[PDB]
Amino acid sequence: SIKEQRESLPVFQFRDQIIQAVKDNQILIVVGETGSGKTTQVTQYLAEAGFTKYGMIGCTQPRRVAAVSVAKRVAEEVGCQLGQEVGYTIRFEDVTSPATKIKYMTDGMLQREILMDPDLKRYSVIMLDEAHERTIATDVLFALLKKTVKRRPDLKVIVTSATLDAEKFSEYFNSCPIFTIPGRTFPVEILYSREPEPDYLEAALTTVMQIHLTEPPGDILVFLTGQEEIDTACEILYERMKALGPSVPELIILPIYSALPSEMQSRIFEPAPPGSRKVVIATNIAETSITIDYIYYVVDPGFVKQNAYDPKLGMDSLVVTPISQAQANQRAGRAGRTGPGKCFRLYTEAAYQSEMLPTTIPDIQRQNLANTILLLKAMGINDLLRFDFMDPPPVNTMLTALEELYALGALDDEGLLTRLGRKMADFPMEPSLSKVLIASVDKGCSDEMVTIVSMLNLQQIFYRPKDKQQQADQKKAKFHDPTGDHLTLLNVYNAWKNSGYSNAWCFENYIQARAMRRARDVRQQIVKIMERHRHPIISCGRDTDKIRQALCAGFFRNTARKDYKTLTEGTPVYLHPSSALFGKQAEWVLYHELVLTTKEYMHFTTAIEPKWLVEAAPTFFKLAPT
RNA sequence: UUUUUUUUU
């Protein structure tokens, strides 16, 4: 029964050996294959081996869903109630009790816990799971746990790794042993394209057609790059199927991407009807976050939309670029979850061998780092450039982050953390947003600022479906403030609140309920943090300008003037068509982010008055006679 | 001027 499942897993074969390996070495690298089941077993093995006696067993996961899934299964396998001996902790949800002995958590959570307790006294063993994904939190934890083990001999650390990176991990973690566990995974025949494919979208559509018409049963999973590309692919495929007479077997074409509402996301999981073949046209969300059952075919175009930060210009760049080998292999493996399968790679073998990096560049080496830098300074680490990162971030990215924190008053001239800086690090957001919150206290608009900040944290607020695009834009424009997007975000939350937090209201007005529910969770958390720091939450009422004054305290660098050209570097930047300021004239502008997609676009742009810049940032804005 | 992959406190 329950025991039978634990024994079937291969990891049971090395159960005694794992426990001894953990006893023998303080830091152990574990290479776990897909079918190993190390996530739900190693945790227990140590708990049954008596490791639970003086500390807790913590295991990180890079995803919230993964943390709750595995905690549910390990609770069921241990036969206790979730929250008792086996619990989980993620943001807004601490499902643990004084009886908790095994604790699954998000890496983020443990990172934030190490700040208040750098020795992590409550834990006897820490396991870093799915570390091959190389989130910023995981990378930070590598360094911090390495330092912590020297202080704490009793602490035991386990770091899961990919096969290629296992040796690299070992040398970094004091040349400690590597434990490899075999995993049961069904074979996937990988077919490369004979010649390079000029158009990856067309090739993917052609390949879907081929498979459906000429291959044995089984649903297809296609990896594309964005929402517009996927919706265009769905429309095109449907029309090609119709072109053929109704004699040809039904092809159910379903998109999947995070912006897609949870109902429509749910329709992908549903089993296909009799004598029908499903194709799921997906982003990289299907690679790890979404696991779809009964996929036997994968079409691999070979591209992903990748974020890369340019600190010189203070701008993210989203570029469709070739995936990595690791990423390509992950994709292939999705055909092999339910049973044996095939993967059609639309690139030549040479291109896998020579045009694709063996590993995706880690997040820490291509994102803004202000948030990370502030946290590390808060923990009292100072020469961050020399800090023991496994893969060190670009030097310019670290210097700009440091300059940013200096400019906001988080750091003094000597580089050390200020009282403001310490306060700001207790808030979970980029430092520029925490600056604005604390500035809003003095400016008497804290109540509005909190909700606004909360909205900024969220992703995909306004739903814009393909067929009903115009209708969405109309409903969105009812909320537009004359000043632009920040106050528009305020309106959306207030109107949601005033409708009694209705999911119906959201659907009607083409607004993602998932986003609004998260905003309320974020808001409640922020309000608690404000109270702890004795910062009062004050409403500005009608005087909304006070919000705009507060925004300049944090976002003075992100400012532009119409011809728009950036105030600092003079670089041209453009209002995004979604903006409430789009068709409108406004001479002086403030924006939340500068992202380069097909054009350099300001995101969440708001109109400002230059007075507010010299008021809020006196040192950085000089007043001169013309 | 015409619309952003994934994910974390």
Residue numbers in the entry: 549 to 1111, 1116 to 1178
Paper text:
DEAH-box adenosine triphosphatases (ATPases) play a crucial role in the spliceosome-mediated excision of pre-mRNA introns. The catalytic activation, the catalysis itself as well as the final disassembly steps are driven by so-called DEAH-box helicases. They all belong to the helicase superfamily 2 (SF2) and share at least eight conserved sequence motifs (motifs I, Ia, Ib, II, III, IV, V and VI) spread over two RecA-like domains that together form the helicase core. Two RecA-like domains, referred to as RecA1 and RecA2, build up the helicase core. The RecA2 domain contains an anti-parallel β-hairpin present in all DExH-box helicases, which protrudes out of the RecA2 domain thereby contacting the C-terminal domains. These domains are divided in three distinct domains, namely the winged-helix (WH), the helix-bundle (HB) and the oligonucleotide-binding (OB) domain.
For the crystallization of the complex structure of ctPrp22 with a single-stranded RNA, a U12-RNA was used, of which nine nucleotides were traceable in the electron density map. In the Prp22-RNA complex structure, the ssRNA is also predominantly bound via polar interactions with the sugar-phosphate backbone. The only exceptions are U9, as the base forms hydrogen-bond interactions with the side chains of N919 and R660, and the bases of U1-U3 that interact via π–π-stacking with F1134 and cation–π stacking with R1012. The thorough analysis of the Prp22–RNA complex structure reveals a novel RNA-binding motif present in the OB-fold domain, which involves H1128, P1129 and F1134 as a stacking triad. H1128 directly interacts via hydrogen-bonding with the phosphate of U4 and the ribose of U3, but also undergoes stacking with P1129, which itself stacks with F1134. This last residue of the stacking triad π–π-stacks in a parallel-displaced manner with the U1 base as well as in an edge-to-face fashion with the U2 base. All these interactions lock the 5′ end of the RNA into a conformation where the bases point into the opposite direction of the β-hairpin of the RecA2 domain. The presence of ADP/ATP seems to stabilize closed conformations of the helicase core regardless of the availability of RNA, while in the absence of adenosine nucleotides the bound RNA suppresses the mobility of the RecA2 domain and stabilizes the helicase core in an open conformation with a RecA1-RecA2 center of mass distance of 31.7 Å. B-factor values of the RecA2 domain are not elevated anymore in the Prp22–RNA complex structure. While the DEAH-box ATPase encloses a stack of four RNA nucleotides in the closed and ATP-bound state, this open and adenosine nucleotide-free conformation accommodates a five-nucleotide stack in the RNA-binding tunnel.
